[PDB]
Design a protein around this ligand. Structure first.
Ligand SMILES: Nc1nc2c(ncn2[C@@H]2O[C@H](COP(=O)(O)OP(=O)(O)OP(=O)(O)O)[C@@H](O)[C@H]2O)c(=O)[nH]1
Ligand SMILES: Nc1nc2c(ncn2[C@@H]2O[C@H](COP(=O)(O)OP(=O)(O)OP(=O)(O)O)[C@@H](O)[C@H]2O)c(=O)[nH]1
Ligand SMILES: [Mg+2]
Ligand SMILES: [Mg+2]
Lengths: 421, 231, 435
């Protein structure tokens, strides 16, 4: 039944994961302690583990290197249906330094959470992999999360490693360090990494949703709405991308090029839609969640997901048309870049919605700006003491910088015409 | 604060780090950790890579001082080598990887042949972690290209080694296969039919590309080198 | 009796086989129980053909000589829990726990290798229950990882232990309209290379042709896989009707290689079928014959009035009278429709099976009193390979998605060999049209 194990890491990771679980509960038709259309019940054992009671508890693990935010979800509404022994937390945080979470205090907690997932896997017919919600900006989410990834693959070498990475933005002064280090790790160990830019996320809430001074919560509603729509193919039968491996093959042409952008539609929260309108609003840069120019660049592969009261034929005719008009944005040497999936289940309360997973080469601008910030500090050898006092090295920094730089070089490289070898 | 014996295993990782580096300098500028291997067999797996990196660095320094008794050596190899291959060659750190291998090679010099060492590395072929399998293959590779089949009964040795080779040659992971083939060309430099036809073709190509010390072998070379001073 | 074992690999293979075994059960009066329909006393086939595909495992109990294979348990579980759960023996439905995930590599080298022993055992169990095993009928897509990877692997091991037995193949050629994978061109080129010398005659089913046929003739704006499979079964049943009933042509698996293939490598005939009416009048022999030479009636999307014809077998079913066919066939020869090859001494071969064709009551197809099926080995089918080779060439020029294969036990050079072999195959189809 191909089960999936979710791991939340850090404040952002545990808060985002929380919104994800709170969302897909209703879609599957569950109470906030785990209890119609019957499609909601089919792939229910993918994200939820059947407790001998007819009641479901999420196959989730909530790790943070400090009780702070993990305490918060603990006594919130969905704090119920979470397995009490899936909560892992240390005494003191990691003060926003990647080194502590990855070498010192984070590594000491890793073994304790491994027991949980090792016990969890001992309850799966045939587990397919893991998904990780974390933030590259901090010290626990980036540092411990990546260390968790590397050791999870050492124990489960043939399982899928999906990841929902949250990218920091210029608005603490060491976020580029932590993000560049985690990226250096993700490019070597992550099978799938959905990149979500906090700047784009913020701009949607402020410009589109006209929320004056938005909160992390509002930011998470968009992350959650995307994650739900993304995993639609994973929680409902008779689809296209049913596995985490099938989805990866269709989306990842080259091993170290597995970082994707996400888009969601509709968004506008006034205070019905038509398939062609929805499709236009899906490819709209105003409806994207990454501060890079998607029109300037090329899509390597695309995977859209339509949900709700929408006919398959009218969705397929609309995607095929959109691909014709914008055939210059889709790479020529990958015939059929786009996989379009339709689901009858509605996100509620919405008649229909569309989720957008793109492997665009324009994402280089995300790694570009961060690499430009990493450099400006690394040249001055700034803030190093806080990292190098945890057992880190200046060489490891230069590796992360030069590595992620090559990552960019590859994206720009593949924006070339039909050339042999 | 002091003493060294407790700091070596004290709760804080940093203390263990500095203490290992102290053991290291103690070895270089020459404290008998040669008697009981359990000591360094604990340090080789320090559970803190930054400190573990230096325990292995110091381990390599420890064996570099000795320079007798083939029975005690077999125990050192049976205790350390499997640990260095499992937790040192599978590591993703440059210093750890290089130093770990050097220990495995230098520990093999204490013996008369690669037999005992190789037979300790072999059972890793049945692990499910690919980079661990490839590490073992690359390890057995290095063992040969450093000492050769010198002082080995190739009648008993090879058919055991090749016994678990085909299964690895068709392994899913690319790197394992790449190292397996690299092990084949070495065995030649001193089986097919169960191998993919295309693998054999590429092998035959790689074959057409050839031009052309244990502890005791060093003691004997110097035994005559010293006695050569009969002026 | 000379038995034939029908092996189905992958999702497409098992779902097509569902339709085929639903129609074969309906043609011979077999209920989902494996029992005879009320009043029969004897199966509508036997004594003549029915014994070949069905095995009377006991009085009144008739079980299809079939083996389903799939690396995921999903598709096959539907059979185990469906209305035909009693038709097959549980030992005939084999499944793994994880699939090949659109990857030919793990289907052939990694995963599919792990379930091989089981399948080779069950086949042997079936082959031992035969008193004169004639051969096999492979049905699988070339797009997915299992039907392509494990399917080709299975066709290789069958040539290994059942060498003297002939094998016929039904391959589901990939189509962009109903594709499930971007790397379908890779999978396709890889298997065709590894099944090019392990198949005596391969019938190609282009999903694009079946799609547009369901769209045009059947008037369905978006045909599902069930729609496609209903049509496909109707054709496959017609292809193997002479085996299961009174046949005057192709009454033997070996007769296919004899009647259709001049050389081993060329064994991909173009299949035509007529008529295909919606379930909402009556036609004739002249019409269905003419329709066989029109572009919108082939299993592969190419022109019947193109290329060179090396062999042709016209197979009629139902209320058909010889005078009409001799007349209708003569109308085709005299009007010089197709262009026969100069070196072939004989031409059109005709077969008649008076057992009327039938469509399932739960299908979108109507029942016709008389229908025809044309199996023609034309050089116009080379265009199908030509098409898939561009798709392949485009990606491979940048080694796109290749790492997925080398990561699953395949050498990068195997792509090269599989490409040259298909390149040679393309040349073979143009050079065989000369003289
Ligand atoms: N979208 C979103 N981002 C968040 C949220 N909380 C924190 N972040 C981001 O995470 C980065 C810092 O890491 P955190 O997740 O807050 O904390 P951590 O990962 O546990 O690391 P430590 O605080 O050192 O333990 C900041 O740059 C924030 O932008 C959240 O609730 N939603
Ligand atoms: N005619 C027909 N083709 C089908 C059907 N289902 C899938 N296909 C074709 O099969 C191709 C994909 O391969 P799969 O059907 O998934 O075969 P598979 O063995 O399950 O492949 P994996 O599950 O990835 O290992 C697609 O191009 C479809 O066109 C069907 O019901 N009828
Ligand atoms: Mg925190
Ligand atoms: Mg399948």
């Amino acid at each position: 039944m191909r089960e999936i194990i979710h791991i939340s890491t850090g404040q952002c990771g545990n808060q985002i994961g929380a919104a994800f679980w709170e969302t897909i509960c209703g879609e599957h038709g569950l109470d906030f302690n785990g209890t119609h259309d019957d499609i909601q019940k089919e792939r229910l054992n993918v994200y939820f583990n059947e407790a001998s009671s007819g009641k479901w508890v999420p196959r989730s693990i909530n790790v943070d290197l400090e009780p702070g935010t993990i305490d918060a979800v603990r006594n919130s509404a969905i704090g119920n249906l979470f397995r009490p022994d899936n909560y892992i937390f240390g005494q003191s945080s990691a003060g926003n330094v990647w080194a502590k979470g990855h070498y010192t205090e984070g590594a000491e907690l890793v073994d304790s959470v491994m027991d949980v997932i090792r016990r969890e896997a001992e309850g799966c017919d045939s587990l397919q992999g893991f998904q990780i919600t974390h933030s590259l900006g901090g010290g626990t989410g980036s540092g411990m999360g990546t260390l968790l990834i590397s050791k999870i693959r050492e124990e489960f070498p043939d399982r899928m490693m999906a990841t929902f990475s949250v990218l920091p933005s210029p608005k603490t002064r060491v976020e580029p360090y932590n993000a560049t280090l985690s990226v250096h790790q993700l490019v070597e160990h992550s099978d799938e990494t959905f990149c979500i830019d906090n700047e784009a996320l913020y701009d949607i809430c402020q410009r589109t949703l006209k929320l004056n001074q938005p909160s992390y919560g509002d930011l998470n509603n968009l992350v959650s709405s995307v994650m739900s729509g993304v995993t639609t193919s994973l929680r409902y039968p008779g689809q296209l991308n049913s596995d985490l491996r099938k989805l990866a093959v269709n989306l990842v042409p080259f091993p170290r090029l597995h970082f994707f952008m996400v888009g969601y539609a509709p968004l506008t929260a006034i205070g019905s839609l038509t398939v062609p309108e929805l499709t236009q609003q899906m490819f709209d840069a105003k409806n994207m969640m990454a501060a890079a120019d998607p029109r300037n660049g090329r899509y390597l592969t695309v995977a859209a997901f339509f949900r709700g009261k929408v006919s398959v034929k009218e969705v397929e005719d609309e995607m095929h048309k959109v691909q014709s008009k914008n055939s210059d944005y889709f790479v020529e040497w990958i015939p059929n870049n786009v996989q379009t999936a339709v689901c009858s289940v509605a996100p509620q309360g919405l008649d229909m919605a569309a989720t957008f997973i793109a492997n665009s080469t324009s994402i280089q601008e995300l790694f570009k700006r961060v690499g430009d910030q990493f450099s400006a500090m690394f040249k001055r050898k700034a803030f190093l003491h806080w990292y190098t006092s945890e057992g880190m090295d200046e060489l490891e920094f230069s590796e992360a910088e030069s590595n992620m730089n090559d990552l960019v070089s590859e994206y720009q490289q593949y924006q070339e015409a039909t050339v042999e070898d | 604060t002091l003493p060294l014996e407790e700091r070596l295993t004290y709760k804080l990782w940093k203390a263990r780090l500095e203490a290992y580096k102290e053991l290291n300098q103690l070895f270089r500028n020459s404290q008998i950790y040669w008697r009981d291997p359990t000591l360094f067999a604990q340090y080789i797996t320090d559970s803190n890579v930054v400190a573990q990196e230096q325990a292995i660095v110091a381990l390599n320094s420890l064996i570099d001082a000795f320079a007798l008794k083939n029975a005690h050596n077999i125990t050192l190899i049976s205790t350390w080598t499997p640990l260095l291959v499992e937790k040192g060659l599978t590591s993703s750190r440059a210093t750890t990887k290089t130093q770990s291998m050097s220990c495995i090679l230098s520990l093999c010099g204490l013996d008369t042949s690669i037999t005992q060492s190789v037979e300790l590395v072999i059972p890793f072929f049945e692990k499910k972690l690919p980079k661990l399998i490839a590490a073992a293959a690359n390890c057995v590779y290095e063992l040969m290209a450093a000492f050769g089949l010198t002082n080995v009964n190739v009648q008993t040795f090879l058919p055991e080694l090749l016994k678990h080779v085909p299964q690895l040659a068709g392994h899913g992971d690319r790197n394992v296969r790449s190292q397996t083939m690299n092990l084949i060309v070495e065995i030649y430099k001193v089986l097919f039919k169960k191998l993919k036809p295309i693998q054999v073709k590429d092998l035959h190509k790689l074959f057409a590309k050839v031009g052309d010390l244990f502890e005791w072998e060093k003691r004997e070379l110097e035994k005559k080198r010293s006695q050569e001073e009969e002026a | 009796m000379r038995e034939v074992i029908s092996i189905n690999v992958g999702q497409a293979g098992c779902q097509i086989g569902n339709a085929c075994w639903e129609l074969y059960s309906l043609e011979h009066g077999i209920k989902p129980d494996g029992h005879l329909e009320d009043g029969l006393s004897k199966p509508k086939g036997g004594e003549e053909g029915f014994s070949t595909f069905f095995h009377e495992t006991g009085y009144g109990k008739f079980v299809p000589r079939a083996i389903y294979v799939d690396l995921e348990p999903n598709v096959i579980d539907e059979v185990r829990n469906g209305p035909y759960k009693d038709l097959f023996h549980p030992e005939q439905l084999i499944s793994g726990k994880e699939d090949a995930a659109n990857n030919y590599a793990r289907g052939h080298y990694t995963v599919g290798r792990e379930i091989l022993g089981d399948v080779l055992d069950r086949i042997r169990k079936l082959a031992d229950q035969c008193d004169g095993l004639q051969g096999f009928l492979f049905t699988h897509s070339l797009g997915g990882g299992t039907g392509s990877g494990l399917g080709s692997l299975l066709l290789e091991e069958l040539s290994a232990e059942y060498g003297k037995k002939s094998k016929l193949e039904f391959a589901v050629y990939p189509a962009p309209q109903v594709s499930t994978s971007v790397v379908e061109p890779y999978n396709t080129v890889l298997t065709t290379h590894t099944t090019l010398e392990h198949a005596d005659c391969t019938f190609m089913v282009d999903n694009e042709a079946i799609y547009d046929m369901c769209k045009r003739n059947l008037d369905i704006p978006r045909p599902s896989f069930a729609n496609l499979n209903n049509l496909i079964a109707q054709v496959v049943s017609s292809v193997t009707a002479s085996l299961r009933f009174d046949g005057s042509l192709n009454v033997d698996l070996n007769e296919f290689q004899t009647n259709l293939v001049p050389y081993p490598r060329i064994h991909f005939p173009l299949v035509s079928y007529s008529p295909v009416l919606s379930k909402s009048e009556s036609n004739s022999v002249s019409e269905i014959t003419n329709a066989c030479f029109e572009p919108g009636n082939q299993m592969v999307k190419c022109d019947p009035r193109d290329g060179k014809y090396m062999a042709t077998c016209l197979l009629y079913r139902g209320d058909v009278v010889t005078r009409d066919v001799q007349r209708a066939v003569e109308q085709v020869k005299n009007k010089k429709t197709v262009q026969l090859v100069d070196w072939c001494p004989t031409g059109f071969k005709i077969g008649i099976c008076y057992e009327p064709p039938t469509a399932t009551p739960n299908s979108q197809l109507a029942t016709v009193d008389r229908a025809v099926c044309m199996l023609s080995n034309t050089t116009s089918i080379a265009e199908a390979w030509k098409r898939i080779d561009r798709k392949f060439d485009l990606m491979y020029a940048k080694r796109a998605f290749v790492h997925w294969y080398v990561g699953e036990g395949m050498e990068e050079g195997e792509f090269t060999e599989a490409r040259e072999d298909l390149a040679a195959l393309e040349r073979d189809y143009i050079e065989v049209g000369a003289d």
